[PDB]
Subunit: 391 residues, 4 copies
């Protein structure tokens, strides 16, 4: 079962040396006892033999093994944060003249990497609506190399029909590299590589760390794409420190029991918001009526705790402050995936500015919630007090 | 004095909160108390206000302040390792169609970044001999954007005439971006920005960490180049974890005493090797007669502990094993800059293969030594026993 | 609610400085800006002003505040492990000529502290059956200074009738110091200081850390006993490092969701064992019929995951190996409270040796289980295969 | 040589697993693969086999091995701080009816442990002047069990004549346990166990950590005393966390270079103070004419950087603030042994209160300096500016 796998993934004696968790091996230099040992380590420097800290130590190898098991991959590359994983995973597969197709709901830094870094290197990015499904085939060009998915989408939470997208891509361009930012599912609520996606990228910063106190990115690739990902990310010097790798492995051990609580509480909040007179729309993948909810129910094994809703009006600046400055339990901060509940607001034009070649279909202020581990009735009371401040 | 500055750099109450060292603030999310505080943080997100962990926490800000003071820069960008600092600093300043001019003695991963990553992104790379001095003017092309120095050079230790190179570049291409990998000097034995170099890059993994147990890159830029470095590195998701930042700041505090011992011991070893009947050549910047020694004496305030020498013969494979497998104090490992002494060997053709457009001028086996903090007479005895195994 | 309190306890801006979690302030030396500041710190050196690392840094103060809130105490002393907390908390309240009255089910190291350390310092120790209730009055001597409870008991899991014990102690010896080892409840499933117990001691090593990778003891005292505990423990140099304090605070944030899973899974396992033909007895506080279950039901707000059962025979060493060496999911290790399930065996004569002045009422091998976060059906299948190896 | 030993002590493959430094193995639970392995671990639970985190992990074993090598001991017990090491090492060897004879220059918390904890447990304490030498024999009682040395003394820096003290103790009470707080020498500038002392105690917090950011105590015993120290300290739950153990091992690797700088700089400052018109007395073991200097010269292999001096007046409150509040390089803080220079003031009556059965022989304000790694001419200028503020 998944909970059993999460408890045990990566925890073998060669890494733990007798403790429950892997040892933390901090190193740049790794010592070779003989020339023959150095030769063996060199041949196997990307295959789990100690060679140099930039390739990893036992602590990294343990996390990589866990991530490959849990996401069903051939290899797991590590990065200093999620944004580095996105940027370097895309970069690993493109060259001057290539085209990238990206969902218009991609995380904003991912879009900005494409428009501000890739563009000046001669790589063009085109965009698609997250519900395009099989019609994505019409957007694939002879030079399309990468198709970049993010399901649910950032902020607005739309869920792709991954089977339809993948089948369409494979009909026209079977060698294309299909990638997904699978952070919301923590890589485990949506088994991306089983759907024919080539690489599943996560900001392990979110639910894998689970406590808002480490940053790390991961990218798990299938056998076809692993060597290129591994070696090109390594040429960019991408790695994570051993201690953060240890904390990510450690986060896996409570991920199941945390996600179940985030799911239960966030769906309860979403159902309540959906009945609320001051709410126009709720964007939660698990809530009926949300964009792509059908595909969430069919293709995912659960939900996490991040979602958004649209208020019945556009808050003025004074109302925004009255609303946001006076919560007792929800905090304003970027990121998500921890034990604390968070809140942020965006006006519709702010979202339109990060929906390339598209418009938004709402006019109220959008509120993004991360539902943490607090008692849900306490969180509901905090939201109700917020509504009373703007009614 | 430098020792006083090393002890005190970056250690102000806003970061230390009453301890001697900065606090370790581990964070992705950073909490805004009000909308107005969030707006202030956003405006100052690259100016030392807490905004998001990818930009940094107090711990990173303290290290950045220290590095800017010590290297005389306007800002310091942080990276997961030295190789990431090199790759991402170069990438931050190029676009397709540009040309990079790099010393042929650059660290091999730096060269491989150019030939295997930059080339396919439309950026070409040419090469120069490290002693080219003023004649580098003749290699500057209409599209040359970056000139990349490394002094002393990797492995073979040639010291550039930086004043001559910089003046020649500035004559032809006043606005070119001149960068140096200043790891051997730990950024402090050679004050690169004072020579008109724009960006000083280090593998802080080496002497700044000082103990072979953390990896981190830094790049300190002048005011002209800082914004582009900062923002382009950020778009690639480049950062370091808070704990490694803390350990780098901590390493600064003993860097002076350590470097003085590495200098004293390595020069004594180099002087002894230069007299030895089994040694053809010694490549140590501080040793009279070594390539660019004149420029080391004029432009540096000291030496570190890394150097190389050439044996009086080409060792066979059996002799290589007899030599390297049987040291008692020197260990075989990559990297350097720690408290432990290290040894590695290369045959001439191995070096030729990483000297683009050039040949090597020696035929014996080259031995690279890192001289650590052990008693120097014990290290000399270990080297003497090695010579007896191959005589 | 408890979940909201656990998420938020100890997190105030003075400690977090903008992050979700408290900063990690590592220090011996704490720097006074002026003589005036040093005088204020000295006066308040046990009252939350920074004075010296042995008293604590911001990180410790944050944890102490959280523990005092959650357990309803006046102060929380910190120790290097649970055993240090037990030994030093008892030591803090005794002098030569005193008597300690301790439950015969106390953790063996607690008993050994009493019989091997206290005895030679002129402090005697007597014993009581954990179900003695109101009859403890007859065991209280004129020199009885400390009454030491542990509910549930170690290994055999008997639950005290705390109201009856406390009322009897206060009738006969109102000034006595009543202490409890409250580790099984994690200090939160049994609110000891609301029952008139003076000091609640925990091995935070167990459920508070929650991941088997830190060691730390805590003792939360009421107002009457705090000053003596604090100052006498400080005279023994008792403290914990800042990083383990941080990790204990961090563990609080998932404690609720973890404990609910440990309760659900362990009670299901206990119910299955209680109908199993190879099981003579099940010792689980939450299982109807277990010793002191009625007091658990009345006085606790939930259960954790540690319990035991007695087999239908005393296993030989060959049978123990066949049983224990071949589990797939349960591991053999000491301690408990983590995400992993653990198994250990005790022969009845081993238990008798640590039940002073009492006898054991079973003859089969006792198996102690820690039920972790794995899927319960997987754990049940592992236990079933174990039974088949010994049937 | 000592530098080579310090670099290499404790660093064997079974602890480093290929890195330069020991792995960091964080654990309470240590997992036994079989019943056979559990039995072997139990038999060897105090002899370097993994058994339970309270006994230690690989990281602790590596530190213990290093400390035993460097101090020439049979075993090394670890503690949460130096004060815990002192208190628990004394406690490990006493029982009701015993007497402790302690130098009246002992660190004040050591004295207070004896007078506030031991006294109420039936253990008495008497005192001796640090220069008593052979005349200590007259103070030894039939029940004297422990003789406790500290050389140099706390604050006032008097060096004992250890050969004369030890010979006198052995002539009258050969079975006594002779202990020393050897923190000032970092355990390596005075090889206590070679002088017939039984146990060498250190606050590893000071020079071994070396950076003012960890707390840890050590006690290295000879073969006669090791088992009692080890087992009685374990019964009090004394241990240190794995990460601080790692950082102590790491501190050893620069201890030699650091101590040489602290010696050179502090002696220069002491010589300057000794000719200064505002200075009445200088207490520095390495300065000719200081109390016990002849014993330091004979018995020590170097000096550290902590010493004191007496001003030519007793500063008023206004003068104390003018002097201490306005230093640019010296910080006011407790503890010492780091890279930062520190300053503290004590009035004569403060010292008199912690010199039991002795009298102070100065009337000016006493200033204790820790001389760090800053440039010594900068430190001298800071002291000179201080003198100008109180002239
Ligand atoms: C979907 C998604 N991908 C990537 C990231 C970036 O991760 P990091 O902040 O670790 O760089 C985030 C940030 O919030 C995210 O939400
Ligand atoms: C000169 C130089 N630059 C960069 C590096 C790369 O540093 P890192 O190993 O931290 O990526 C090294 C590696 O040995 C180096 O010697
Ligand atoms: C009930 C109880 N108290 C105290 C302890 C001791 O805690 P530590 O191992 O952290 O010293 C334990 C050990 O398993 C325990 O179970
Ligand atoms: C000589 C001496 N021993 C012991 C200690 C106590 O060490 P710790 O602060 O680690 O408890 C100190 C404190 O300054 C000390 O100077
Ligand atoms: Cl194709
Ligand atoms: Cl130009
Ligand atoms: Mg190896
Ligand atoms: Mg909150
Ligand atoms: Mg060595
Ligand atoms: Mg398991
Ligand atoms: Mg006054
Ligand atoms: Mg200072």
């Amino acid at each position: 079962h998944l909970d059993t796998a999460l408890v045990n993934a990566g925890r073998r004696k060669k890494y733990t040396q007798g403790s429950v968790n892997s040892v933390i091996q901090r190193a740049s230099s790794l010592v070779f006892d003989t020339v023959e040992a150095k030769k063996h380590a060199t041949r196997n420097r990307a295959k789990g033999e100690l060679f140099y800290g930039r390739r990893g130590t036992l602590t990294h190898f343990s996390l990589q093994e866990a991530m490959c098991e849990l996401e069903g991959g051939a290899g797991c590359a590590l990065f200093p944060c999620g944004a580095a994983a996105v940027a370097n995973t895309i970069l690993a597969f493109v060259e001057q003249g290539d085209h990238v197709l990206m969902t218009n709901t991609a995380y904003e830094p991912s879009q900005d990497f494409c428009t501000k870094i890739l563009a000046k290197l001669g790589v063009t990015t085109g965009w698609f609506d997250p519900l395009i499904g099989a019609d994505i085939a019409n957007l694939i060009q002879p030079n399309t190399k990468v198709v970049f998915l993010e399901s649910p989408g950032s902020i607005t939470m739309e869920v792709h029909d991954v089977p339809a997208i993948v089948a369409a891509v494979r009909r026209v361009a079977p060698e294309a590299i299909i990638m997904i930012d699978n952070t919301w599912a923590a890589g485990v609520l949506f088994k991306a590589l089983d759907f024919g996606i080539d690489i599943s990228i996560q900001a392990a910063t979110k639910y894998l760390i689970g406590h808002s106190d480490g940053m790390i990115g991961t990218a798990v690739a299938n056998a076809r794409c692993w060597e290129q990902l591994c070696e090109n990310a390594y040429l960019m010097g991408q790695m994570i420190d051993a201690d953060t790798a240890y904390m990510t492995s450690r986060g896996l051990r409570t991920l199941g029991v945390r996600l179940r609580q985030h799911h239960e509480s966030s769906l309860r909040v979403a159902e309540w918001l959906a009945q609320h007179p001051q709410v126009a729309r709720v964007n939660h993948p698990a809530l009926p009526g949300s964009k792509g909810h059908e595909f969430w129910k069919r293709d995912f094994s659960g939900s996490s705790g991040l979602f958004s809703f649209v208020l019945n009006k556009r808050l003025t600046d004074a109302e925004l402050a009255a609303y946001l400055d006076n919560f007792s339990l929800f905090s304003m901060a970027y990121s998500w995936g921890g034990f604390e509940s968070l809140i942020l607001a965006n006006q519709p034009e702010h979202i339109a500015a990060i929906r390339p070649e598209a418009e938004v279909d709402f006019s109220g202020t959008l509120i993004r919630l991360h539902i943490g581990l607090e008692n849900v009735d306490d969180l509901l009371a905090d939201l109700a007090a917020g509504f009373a401040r703007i009614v």
